[PDB]
Design a protein around this ligand. Structure first.
Ligand SMILES: CCC[C@H](C)Oc1ccc(C(C)(C)C)cc1NC(=O)c1nnn(-c2cc(C)ccc2OC)c1C
Ligand SMILES: CCC[C@H](C)Oc1ccc(C(C)(C)C)cc1NC(=O)c1nnn(-c2cc(C)ccc2OC)c1C
Lengths: 278, 290
């Protein structure tokens, strides 16, 4: 079985997830709505329609335009920036209530969240992804996709959903991604690296104590391979986001902070959120 | 053929329609849309839910980029969700009525009547002329009123069930007649010049005027359509106009009942509903004056 400290480690991560992940998206408000070639082709694969279900029973449905070559390909990017910002704020709170993360220097806290923001966001998105309908079910909001598995982020969501992970395995993936000692700007490398290794050992122990079926053979090494793949997808899409923001500005002030290539000065919003409570 | 007096009478109506009917709804802007995300009073509330459930549509809004916003209405759950579209339809009705006001203003026959009879005629005919213009953009195949970039599609709340609703039976039957523009605009004049509206004083004048429009329409049909096949088209049109007046009274009473428990009417609509004739209709009076 799991050791006591591993039991406590999982318990703290799960408690953090429950306290900082609003799976109903009920507090997502005041978002915007609709009024290089490799990017355009990739943006075509991820084309989604937006459905908003009101409490009264009504449904607003947005179908995106077709690719005509103009600025029509970015009609949903302002909205997704507001959704990404809301999602990241939950990620910040998730990290803040973790004991191992809260004790790191403030700049390493900034650097870790900066390097893992997209990765923990995609991990939480996967838990609301419906692989049958191709829809991310975000409470009252739904995002339904329109060979398309060629796109890496799309392929990632299908591959990860196929593993049928438990909540504990998702939250341990989040901790492994969060405590990456090789993020730019990290100073406490050995401290963060020692923390990451214990999360990975905890995940391996959890899988062996709860997943005996042959369908879950090599599941731990599959998860670690998925985490390395997600870090690659992070680099591609962050770089892709900078090109788009250059051409058509869409990023919220908090997102611009993530995209900037002193530490607390360049990240005033993230710095304030790390100092605020919950 | 038609006499020249009937010819110029049609020319004036067609000219009126061309200048005041925004058929593409291009200048319908800044409208409201549904938001994103006792004892005898129970009888008044129960009655309104029956009024609002017979007529249910989804709203479609097409953007210039090619995108499509679509609104699907909620189901009757007992709350205010049954009024989710009344703000929009208040803005649409107001926009249409102002076009109807302008339509009557440029007809010389209507301009020469006393201002209080003009108020009384537009008050009694506003709904009817609005439905008549709505029918010209009504698609009977898809059950959709196509108002430029806005579309209102009937929901299958069967069809023989929907045909029971007189306002929907009106739009399907009138569309099936496949009327010309001239016949629609003559229906509008016959409806506008109804001598039996409340508050009209020059009834004999308005009746003579209505009869000349009706005779003009009857003559138009005899001279412009194959004789045997359209032998009763004029009588069908007049029968449609007679039913439209009953639909007018029926739906005007529904609006007053809804306004009682859930106000939604714009100021110009409040004047039309009854919420000196000139002092009770200051907005409509001002629009007729300019
Ligand atoms: C709600 C579910 C969205 C699905 C999972 O996905 C999309 C599907 C469609 C589309 C478009 C608009 C192209 C149709 C976009 C996206 N997804 C993004 O817009 C996006 N997802 N994560 N992040 C991001 C987040 C951080 C913290 C930091 C950096 C980040 O980007 C590097 C962003 C900006
Ligand atoms: C543009 C397509 C709408 C179709 C044709 O129709 C409806 C379909 C659905 C609905 C609801 C909201 C119930 C789903 C309403 C309505 N229609 C009205 O809301 C309405 N149509 N004409 N008028 C009206 C106008 C005047 C000048 C004077 C008086 C009038 O009402 C007595 C009004 C207020």
């Amino acid at each position: 079985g799991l050791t006591e400290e591993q039991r406590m480690m999982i318990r703290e991560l799960m408690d953090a997830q429950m306290k900082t992940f609003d799976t109903t998206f009920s507090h997502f408000k005041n978002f915007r709505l609709p009024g290089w070639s490799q990017v355009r082709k990739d943006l075509c694969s991820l084309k989604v329609s937006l459905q908003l279900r009101g409490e009264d029973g009504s449904v607003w449905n947005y179908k995106p335009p077709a690719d005509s070559g103009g600025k029509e390909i970015f009609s949903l990017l302002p909205h997704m920036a507001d959704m990404s910002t809301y999602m990241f704020k939950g990620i910040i709170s998730f990290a803040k209530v973790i004991s191992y993360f809260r004790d790191l220097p403030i700049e390493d806290q900034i650097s870790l969240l900066k390097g893992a923001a997209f990765e923990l966001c995609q991990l939480r998105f996967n838990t609301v992804f419906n692989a049958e309908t191709g829809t991310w079910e975000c409470g009252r909001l739904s995002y339904c996709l329109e060979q398309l598995l060629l796109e890496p982020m799309l392929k990632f969501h299908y591959m990860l959903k196929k593993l049928q992970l438990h909540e504990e395995e998702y939250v341990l993936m989040q901790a492994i991604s969060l405590f990456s000692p090789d993020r730019p700007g990290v100073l406490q490398h050995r401290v963060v690296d020692q923390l990451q290794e214990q999360f990975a050992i905890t995940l391996k122990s959890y899988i062996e104590c709860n997943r005996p079926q042959p369908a879950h053979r090599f599941l731990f090494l599959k998860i670690m391979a998925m985490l390395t793949e997600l870090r690659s997808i992070n680099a591609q899409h962050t770089q892709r986001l900078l090109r788009i923001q250059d051409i058509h500005p869409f990023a919220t002030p908090l997102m611009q902070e993530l995209f900037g290539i002193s530490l607390t000065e360049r990240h005033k919003i993230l710095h304030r959120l790390l100092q605020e409570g919950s």
